[PDB]
Design a protein around this ligand. Sequence first.
Ligand SMILES: *C[C@]1(O)C[C@@](C)(OC)O[C@H](/C=C/C(C)=C/C[C@@H]2O[C@H](C)[C@H](NC(=O)/C=C\[C@H](C)OC(C)=O)C[C@@H]2C)[C@H]1O
Ligand SMILES: [Zn+2]
Ligand SMILES: [Zn+2]
Ligand SMILES: [Zn+2]
Lengths: 842, 74, 92, 870
Amino acid sequence: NLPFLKPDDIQYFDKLLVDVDESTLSPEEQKERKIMKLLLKIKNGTPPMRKAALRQITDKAREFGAGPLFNQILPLLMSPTLEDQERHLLVKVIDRILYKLDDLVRPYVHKILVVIEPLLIDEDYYARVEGREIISNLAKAAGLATMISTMRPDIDNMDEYVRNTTARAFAVVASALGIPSLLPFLKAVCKSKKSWQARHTGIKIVQQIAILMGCAILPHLRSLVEIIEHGLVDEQQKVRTISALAIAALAEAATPYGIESFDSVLKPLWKGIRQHRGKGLAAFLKAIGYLIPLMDAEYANYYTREVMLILIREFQSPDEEMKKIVLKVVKQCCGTDGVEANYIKTEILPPFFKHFWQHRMALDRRNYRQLVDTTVELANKVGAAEIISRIVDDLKDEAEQYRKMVMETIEKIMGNLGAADIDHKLEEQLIDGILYAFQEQTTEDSVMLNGFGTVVNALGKRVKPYLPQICGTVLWRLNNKSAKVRQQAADLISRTAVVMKTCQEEKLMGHLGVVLYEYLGEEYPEVLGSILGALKAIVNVIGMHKMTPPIKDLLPRLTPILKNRHEKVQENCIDLVGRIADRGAEYVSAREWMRICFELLELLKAHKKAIRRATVNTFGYIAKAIGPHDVLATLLNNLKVQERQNRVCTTVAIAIVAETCSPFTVLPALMNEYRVPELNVQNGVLKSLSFLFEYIGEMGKDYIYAVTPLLEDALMDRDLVHRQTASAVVQHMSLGVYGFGCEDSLNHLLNYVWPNVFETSPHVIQAVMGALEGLRVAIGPCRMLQYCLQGLFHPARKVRDVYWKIYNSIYIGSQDALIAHYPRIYNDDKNTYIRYELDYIL
Amino acid sequence: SQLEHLQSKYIGTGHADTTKWEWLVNQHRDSYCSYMGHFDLLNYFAIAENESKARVRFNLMEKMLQPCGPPADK
Amino acid sequence: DLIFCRKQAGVAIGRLCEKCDGKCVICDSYVRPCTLVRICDECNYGSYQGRCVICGGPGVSDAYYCKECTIQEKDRDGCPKIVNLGSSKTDL
Amino acid sequence: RRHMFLYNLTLQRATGISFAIHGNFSGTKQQEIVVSRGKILELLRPDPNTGKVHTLLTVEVFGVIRSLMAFRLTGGTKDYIVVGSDSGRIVILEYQPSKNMFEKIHQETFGKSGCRRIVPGQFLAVDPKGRAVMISAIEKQKLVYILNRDAAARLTISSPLEAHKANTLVYHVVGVDVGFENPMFACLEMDYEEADNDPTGEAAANTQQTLTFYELDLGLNHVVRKYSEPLEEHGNFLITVPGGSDGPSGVLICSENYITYKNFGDQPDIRCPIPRRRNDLDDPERGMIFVCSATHKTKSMFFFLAQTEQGDIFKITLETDEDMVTEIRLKYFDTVPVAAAMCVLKTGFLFVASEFGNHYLYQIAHLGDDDEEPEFSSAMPLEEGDTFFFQPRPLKNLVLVDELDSLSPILFCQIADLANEDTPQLYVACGRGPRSSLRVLRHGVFNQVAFPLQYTPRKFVIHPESNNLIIIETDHNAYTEATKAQRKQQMAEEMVEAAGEDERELAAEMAAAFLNENLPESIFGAPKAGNGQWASVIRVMNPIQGNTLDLVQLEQNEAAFSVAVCRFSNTGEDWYVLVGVAKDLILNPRSVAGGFVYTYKLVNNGEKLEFLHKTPVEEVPAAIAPFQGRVLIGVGKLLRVYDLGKKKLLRKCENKHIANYISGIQTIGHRVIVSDVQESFIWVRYKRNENQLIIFADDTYPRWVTTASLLDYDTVAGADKFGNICVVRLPPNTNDEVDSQKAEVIMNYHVGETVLSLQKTTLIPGGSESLVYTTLSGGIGILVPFTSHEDHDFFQHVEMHLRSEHPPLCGRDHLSFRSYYFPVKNVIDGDLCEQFNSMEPNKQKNVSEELDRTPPEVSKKLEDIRTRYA
Ligand SMILES: *C[C@]1(O)C[C@@](C)(OC)O[C@H](/C=C/C(C)=C/C[C@@H]2O[C@H](C)[C@H](NC(=O)/C=C\[C@H](C)OC(C)=O)C[C@@H]2C)[C@H]1O
Ligand SMILES: [Zn+2]
Ligand SMILES: [Zn+2]
Ligand SMILES: [Zn+2]
């Protein structure tokens, strides 16, 4: 039938609503109606409808012609109400029909371009991708000649944005047909005697080719540079600027290769910056800054020494774009081998820090980010302390944004290089600065948190003398009226607990733990989670015997926090309880651990896997601590008294007990639970066994015989659910013990799994086939093939169907191994079936 | 969320109407490709005969077109 | 009806939403993730990138094949992004 | 007793080479060679000063390397290594000289494991500019990966692009040097769809090979079968012709008796026949193909080196007018053993990786264009089937610089102290054809001494009294010495019957000259006799020196396969040598006229073979085992107890119920273990009172057994053709008089190489016992039993941790690789555990305290097993 029509689809598919006779209309009207039906089935249809309609519109593309096809496609493609994936579908349609239409699209190239090329400036990245895609498919369908003929008249257009659009289109055409195809046209255009606009457009085409194609331009980098190099001395200023920018783009695309191809440009730029001012000088400097990291050490030293005077002069330029370009250039040239560290120290660093490191630059995001990254990269070469000491005092400036900038810079530098370069004076300066910055916080800056943390962790045991005042400020902020300050303080505690331990200040740690324990009634969940994390850090650093509060008081306080609904509280409290159960279950009775287990059972079905993992770990620790018998008895009782919703929680807990305290403490009672003639209890036992073996894996290698009789009973039981679950257990066993020598027990169980291959219920035969695949893995494909060969050519068609399904699974799984396992099939009167090579004996 | 269509599209699988000739042709083609993969199998075969490894590979590739002879009509 | 895409997977890493975090897309097991899931390029294009390989919603974690699936090389069967053959591109 | 738990260790790594590529893997001007020994990736560095090849790196990849190439991107100075194997994954590695390791840069997954038919991995082809790489299966499936760089000049890989075609077989794939145009891949293909639907069978005879050019359009991001033309001569491989501004950018298709230049477009095909040897002693019905090729590019020229089936290398250059090729020019270069790969280094050296035996490094002294040896060309005219001629001669353009020892292939081995050196020596039957040898290996890595032999050695037995070796050397497609001399004489006489009276003075002394020349088959190769023709001799040789104490040459088309030295109870202490040989044996399809068992008397302190008599048998006598004063002989299916009569060997007792064919016979007490060619081991009970041979036990699995060794009265260890080792055992108190019993497989392991010798011994006196095996790739390995279960658990945990943290280099799963044909059982891979030293310190320490030890203790515990060896 006809796919559903949304309101915005009416204007485009209204003709399909009127039930015309379809033998009355024009052949052109018939063409239009068929194209409309195909486009509707593509845009609104199901995947099969889309596939069929796409195939048919591709096969009928030449019959339809490029005229009607694009006449209907272009309004749909540029529909303001069109969705992104619908646009992608239409772009794929355009690609297919273009590939099939080839040169028949030539008369419509201009109109296709005028309609679509607004996509190349769209905010959506994928919209620009699809615009370039359409242009490249059009260029390869129509050919270079007609693309040039169509787009040439706008090369010297008076409007600059028309020229920019044409330049981007020509860059995409060059990416489609290759740079050598456009090389002579560009060579002619960039040197056009008629107007500077044409030269500007050609050089911009070269720049856009660089930006679009990246490192793929390297084979033709020399040709592009030779084509555009004259523009640097052009009489028109805009041509010089676009030539420098194109050189910069080519250098960026060629990084880190191709420095030789720029030789003829080195002297012009070097001279141009000694004459030009403004944006032309900025473009020349940008080109130089992208060229320098491509040079070898000696010439790099020479060239940046030649340009450094102009660079340091422009350090004080008022125009912000010039300052951004100059910052990029200092970052680039100082990051180049050959520019010595002492030269940067003496010549570059003082003016850089005097003119760029001012509180004005911290109020703009771009300047902030660029100066931070540049200063960190500078410290990477010239030394951490050398840069940190030049801004450390500004850590106490009253401008909070400036403080944030300095703190982020120091944080990154010390996280990259450490504190081995920092002496005592700068160490105390850092301590005082980070203390002041953390105290004078009005916005709860995560940058201050990260800076404090990394500074303390890099100082290491050297912060030992400052830990009194640090923990004093931490306790002060822990009692702040606003809970977010408390959360930040607890996070800082967790971040620095390790270093605080290696400093041997356990009394302050104990007081911090006491304060955090007093805050466990925090009503705000994120704050409570951070407090629990800080308490876990303090417990991990102090130990279980000397912890304050004592563990015997701490864990029962944590028991009711397990029912909190916030996932952060859940994860943190579960991890804390888990470490307590791992290394300090001494101080907790078995009954309290049973209460914890009861609260923990429900969190095994959480959606977040981190919470499930923490619950598994902690439950395993508790089972190891208290032993299996009591918890296993509780779990088996639960298994009998509840239905699916919490039965799988109990199954997972039983498997955890069996994995932690070994399965011979669980399997006897679990299998004894199977003797109850209530059937559903037997199904629960079977599901528990399935998950137990899937969970314990290799550990199950010693327990196949132990559960073999029950599996014999269940695989032959009247209930097909029993058979299905027993086959699942067999699958999990064989996959879990794969490669551990259980071939004979699994071979025995295979004889009980096999007769169910003729079961008709899909849920049953699916489990049987899964068990058979696991058994192929564990026993080997040869045994499975031996079972298969009897029914591969059985007279009954049903037997052949079953055995060929099994053979297909084995063959797909074990194609190369079967070569050694195929049986000897003798020749007949017509064909040779002997593999004589395998009968060779040296 | 399932079906055997892609199993049908894998070369070498079969069905209830698969003939003996097709099964053994698949076996022989698989075996020849395996010999050309497992280096020591081809070493054995090239030592048994007195041929270079390249000659053995060429012969096995030429045998892949009809390894079991022409098929039957019915 | 839902099926598997099963196209030749590429470099894109499949993702799961918050509802199925940690599940194996082939066998539905939560036990022992093993190998990163790879998906076809068409299933990761545009607004579909980083989306759940089951529902198309926001992805919050990397999708994995379970240990049993990688043992059986069920990680080598193609893009496991679930396709709804009864829906259209803008449905649900 | 509890089932044995074994620890596997390679003592001597495989030395055969299947692939060798050369490049700048260090990133400097130094040129290295990456070779694949099969399951081992090795990095060699030839020194231009001394001309000696040093091995830099050796890595067990625990897979089957099937394709190995090098590539580089525009502007780079280091060659990356691309490997395709049996892992269903393609990997790209980069050698790091600072740490001496293969860093895996990329690993991309596309299909299932194994050496499969339709899953790619067998073939690799790279765009000469390093922009794309195609990995190909033999049938149907091909995949293309786009390669690029990022900002930090780090290699990036794309999703795979498909280029499949059903019912299409692939002979070879090679990238075309189309300059910087769209990348192109040329493949030899053949479509079998027509042959599979023609019951008449001549659609198969009319089916012809195709040369197909696939084009990767980078902009449109797809691959299209753009060109494809049939060929008259089916090709065996392709060679990249340099392109862009460096050459015409076609493909050189090598075929039987021809080499053709082809290129899509208006370029015509240029054919040139391969120059054959003048007075070639081979079978005249045999064609000629190239076995390998090398391409060297200079600033001024480019040339190729193509080696024949007989070891003769031809230098191939292409003459070019306009941008088409005018002709193909060839010239006889030199003659070196048949190679699987050749590498021309820019320093002036040629590396020859022989397909069997030792490898070589020669110095290119002269390019061979300033002598009066004739040049051949496609332009030259021949009519009919004349095909040019040349005469081989000793080395003129190359001189031998280095010889790399390699035991590949090993067909038989015996560990014994025949030199009274206290510690036993390893006596190994290595080599193939005229380059076969017997080598003695001593522990101290093994020091080797080689003694040359004539044909391929099949078995050898040690005389208990004389301690000498009695070797049987056999070869298919081979002439006897008498037949060779007779053919030489006859072809000289037919030389001078033909031609004219004009100057017999010339021809009669040319023929004489031709008969005075004896080109050593060790260098130029033995003449190929043709199908069903065999050459075989028996050799009594001293094991300390290399002297052939005696040699007996057998009839033409008589092929020795079994040899035994024994005594008989009806005779006294006289030693006898029995040699079983086949007569008129053809391998494919198999048939035979019968066989003969030669009985010689060993006289003169085991130095002379005195022919006693010869007994005919209705099938190949493939196994001969002494058995309490009589012999056990396998005549195909039949197992027979024979006694020595003074005119023939008399059949004393027989069992005729073995499945297919008896490859081996071993005895302990009155239990005889018979190896079937396909059906594993069969236990037969000889009841001496009733004089009967009864089968009482067999296996539950088929097994293509190659060798076996009796562990005890119930336990048999064996190896198969598919690179597996098994240990099977009869259940306790298995009655030898009941009907049916089944052996239990108590051990399974995939070695990765085909094992042909397996022996329980102690290689060091004062150490415990172990199982030593040898392989066809020249490897020597050991299986060592575990004493404690604590050590067993420790090493098992080590293996399990290494499987996760140090996965096989080429993408394979280690557990799956060791479970190639049967699931691994009761063996731990020590070659994997010993890679603990090759890990980074953090991994070492993490998994060391996973074991709760220091990495020193771990590595010392690993080395202690290697020093104790049992
Ligand atoms: C993709 C989905 O199918 C989508 C949706 C809406 O399907 C109905 O939601 C599914 C989520 C199901 C959940 C969260 C079920 C809870 C189950 O809880 C039992 C107790 C099991 N728990 C575990 O196996 C727990 C821990 C395991 C041993 O370890 C780890 C690390 O997971 C399984 C379920 C989680 C969603 O899948
Ligand atoms: Zn997909
Ligand atoms: Zn989802
Ligand atoms: Zn799974």
